[PDB]
Amino acid sequence: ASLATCYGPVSADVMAKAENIRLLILDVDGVLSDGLIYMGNNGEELKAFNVRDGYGIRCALTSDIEVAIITGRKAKLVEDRCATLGITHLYQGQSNKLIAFSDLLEKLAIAPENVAYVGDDLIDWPVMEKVGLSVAVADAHPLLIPRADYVTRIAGGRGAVREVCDLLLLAQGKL
Amino acid sequence: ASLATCYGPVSADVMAKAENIRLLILDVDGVLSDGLIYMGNNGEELKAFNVRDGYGIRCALTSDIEVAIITGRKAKLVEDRCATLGITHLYQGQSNKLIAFSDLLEKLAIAPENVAYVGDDLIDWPVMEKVGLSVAVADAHPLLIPRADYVTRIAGGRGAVREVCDLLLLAQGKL
Amino acid sequence: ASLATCYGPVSADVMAKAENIRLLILDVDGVLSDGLIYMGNNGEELKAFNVRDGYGIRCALTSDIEVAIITGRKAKLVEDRCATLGITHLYQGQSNKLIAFSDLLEKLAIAPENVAYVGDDLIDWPVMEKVGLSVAVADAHPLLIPRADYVTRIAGGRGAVREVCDLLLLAQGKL
Amino acid sequence: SLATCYGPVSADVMAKAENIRLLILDVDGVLSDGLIYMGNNGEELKAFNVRDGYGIRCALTSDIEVAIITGRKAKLVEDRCATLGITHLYQGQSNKLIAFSDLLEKLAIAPENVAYVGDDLIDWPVMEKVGLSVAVADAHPLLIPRADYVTRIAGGRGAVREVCDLLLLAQGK
Ligand SMILES: O=C(O)[C@@]1(O)C[C@@H](O)[C@@H](O)[C@@H]([C@H](O)CO)O1
Ligand SMILES: O=C(O)[C@@]1(O)C[C@@H](O)[C@@H](O)[C@@H]([C@H](O)CO)O1
Ligand SMILES: [Mg+2]
Ligand SMILES: [Mg+2]
Ligand SMILES: [Mg+2]
Ligand SMILES: [Mg+2]
Known part of the structure; x- marks a missing residue:
């Protein structure tokens, strides 16, 4: 029940x-x-x-x-970053992150258990509570850390997303 | 006598x-x-x-x-920051910080004991000596750290202010 | 043997x-x-x-x-950086690092064993595997680190390149 | 022996x-x-x-x-100097001894009256000559054992403040 x-x-x-x-x-x-x-x-x-x-x-x-x-x-810099990487599902100016989450579930015909969320602050928790794989980065707000299924070893903006991406691809054979 | x-x-x-x-x-x-x-x-x-x-x-x-x-x-960058945050009490070009302090106290009908101040160098001290709660950030100047009522665990610009906000709300039953 | x-x-x-x-x-x-x-x-x-x-x-x-x-x-920023340092051999927009590598060795009439390569991610490996001295920076991807001949003590962008330059010069009696 | x-x-x-x-x-x-x-x-x-x-x-x-x-x-260095009131600025210096010499004559001081805070080997020719040579905490490894003093604070993080604080303490300020 534990993998390297x-x-x-x-x-x-x-x-x-x-x-x-x-x-x-x-x-x-x-x-x-x-x-x-x-x-x-x-x-x-x-x-x-x-x-x-x-x-x-x-x-x-x-x-x-x-x-x-x-x-x-x-x-606009976030729009640029997304456009350069090929990310299309960008949601900006979201106060309540639950709205976009529900939108995504419907547009992708996907269930909450098929979703992973990487967050760093308590405003992310309402969505994180509902998803299949909730992830806090290493230096997330202290109260979010114990709440996640997985805590990254790498800090936000230092390769935390790479770590999660690496994990998904390892689990799905695709690495 | 101490709290988590x-x-x-x-x-x-x-x-x-x-x-x-x-x-x-x-x-x-x-x-x-x-x-x-x-x-x-x-x-x-x-x-x-x-x-x-x-x-x-x-x-x-x-x-x-x-x-x-x-x-x-x-x-202007400081003006832009406050507008974004909802801060309407901005004092720029303040050599003598006590003037701004007195203005604030008369303007809000408040006592020095109702005031918290977060500083990081020795120029901050004259005001910090007067307030109810003096705070030094984790990476404040070495000589200011021992004088403050509270030293934060987080350094300036890394979430020290969040820490102080979290603290004030917790103390006031709003966390 | 080992050397200080x-x-x-x-x-x-x-x-x-x-x-x-x-x-x-x-x-x-x-x-x-x-x-x-x-x-x-x-x-x-x-x-x-x-x-x-x-x-x-x-x-x-x-x-x-x-x-x-x-x-x-x-x-442009990288071009500017090379002009300042005096680096004349700059390959840009290279999807296949092996092609650039081949052109580089043929242009300079150098054998692969006379080449050192410094990398930080797994895409670098195909080229690093062919060279005489493979180097991974201290904060390279964890899967690259064990494969390299040498792992720098210093992190990328903090003097890791200096450490490698110092090593080469030391080994050749020039530091 | 001094705190x-x-x-x-x-x-x-x-x-x-x-x-x-x-x-x-x-x-x-x-x-x-x-x-x-x-x-x-x-x-x-x-x-x-x-x-x-x-x-x-x-x-x-x-x-x-x-x-x-x-x-x-x-220009950004020139701007930073103007803010701080620094008037003695020498840029584009491949050899730092030439500016050093110039400062000694302009200010009418001796090398022993000078302190130099450095980070790399290029600084050593000058640092070797001054009264107080200083390496920042995260200077080049070979520079550190050579200086009279090594700061606790790393460069750009407050190392200069530490040296200024030390100079003022020693001169009763
Ligand atoms: O950094 C913040 O304090 C702030 O609340 C300021 C806002 O301008 C904005 O940056 C906000 C973001 O919505 C968080 O990504 O953070
Ligand atoms: O940062 C450097 O690598 C560099 O070599 C860049 C050069 O333009 C030059 O400024 C040099 C200086 O001698 C160090 O300040 O540093
Ligand atoms: Mg966030
Ligand atoms: Mg200050
Ligand atoms: Mg790279
Ligand atoms: Mg330097």
Whole structure:
């Protein structure tokens, strides 16, 4: 009931859950980035994405695992990042993340148990509570950590998404 | 005599001080930001803010805790940040922080004991000496750390403000 | 046998491989860079390089070791980075790293055993497997690390390239 | 044998620090963490620490001159100097001894009256000559054993503030 991965051992329950995943949902801030928003004196805004996560996302997409993003902010740079990686299911300016989640379930003809969610803060928990595989990144808010099925060894924006992508592909044979 | 929080145990005295807080005063550099200034050849000036802190701030503002910012310089990026966060008490170009402190206290009909202040350097101290709850961020200057009522576990720009918000709400039964 | 370096002891086999190196091939992402891509709302893209790496590369170039870059996509910033350091052998937009590798060896009339390659992800392996000295940076993908002849103590974008330059120069009596 | 807020320092380091009339700083890896942000439009950024700034401002208002000798050339460094009130700036310096010499004559001081905070081997020719040589915590490995003092704080994280704090303590400020 416990299997070796290149990040350390995971339980067979987590691995069984990962095998059923058809949709991976991600936060942006704190998951794809480290949480920082860079702001300038005339409208300049930057975010830092991890390139190893991008390969993870590319691999998932070419391996029949849809990737969606549900974020509370609206930013063209996020639209650019998604468009460069081939992510189409982008949801911006979402206060209540449950709406987009239900939308995704219907559009993909998919059940909550076929969904994985990678989050870092308590606003993600209403959705995380419902999905097949809930994941907190290593440096998520302290109260979210014990609530997840799986906690990543790698921090948000440092390869946390790559780790999850690696896990899904290992569980589904496709690695 | 001490209580559990999600960041670690705190003393009863710190909790008793946090229960009484009606105003949270924050610095920009080293508290909301990572303490760095990102400068370019086009004259760009960027500061990095953390997504973890803003959720905390919005929760505080909706839970009858006013949030103010007192800062020594004048920057549009700081104006832009407050607008986004819902902060209407912004004091820029403040050499003498006690002036802003007195203004705040008369403007909100509040006593010094109802005020919390999060700082990171020695310039913060004259105000911190007056407040009900003085807070130093984890990576504050070594000489400020021992003077503060509370030292956060999280460093500036990494969610230290969130920690303080989490603390105040917990103490006031709104976490 | 083993030998002291300023980063820690190295095996005589690694030192022996480093003695024959006439060409150092470097990745951009996660090797020369911190592995991040900084993106902006109005189309900005930035990558962070490290000053410790630059001095090493120029020492290498002036000490009979060519330095080359093979990379996935075309970017002005990387072109600019190569001009500053004096790297003339730059392959951009290379989907197949093996083709660039072949052209590189034929252009410089060098045998694969006289080549070192520094990587951070699994895509680098096909080329790293053919060279005389394979190097993985300290924070490379966990599956790449055990395969490499040498794993740097220093993380990509923090002086890992300098560490490798220092090794090659040490092995050849030039540090 | 002497306590500071960053930890114990030797009386020897403190004596050297008492005599300092000029603090020379590297930019890359001392005032910043060594990273150079470069973009597709030719943007170049660097990250400075604000706490270092206050330290620098205290040094200048406390009869200690502050100078910058750097191998790179950038307007952003000029901008940072103007903010801090640093007037002695030497950019594009392949050989740091030439700027060093210039400072000695302009300020009418001796090498023993100088402190140098460095991060890499290029700094050693100058560091070898000064009264107080300083390596930042995360400087090049070979540089560290050579300096009179090694900071607890890493470059771009407050190492300069620590040196300024040390100089002011030694000179009774
Ligand atoms: O970082 C934050 O404090 C904040 O609440 C500020 C908002 O501008 C926005 O960045 C918000 C995001 O919705 C989180 O991704 O975070
Ligand atoms: O950061 C470097 O690798 C580099 O070599 C880049 C060069 O442009 C030059 O600025 C150099 C300086 O000598 C270090 O500040 O650093
Ligand atoms: Mg988040
Ligand atoms: Mg401050
Ligand atoms: Mg790479
Ligand atoms: Mg340097």
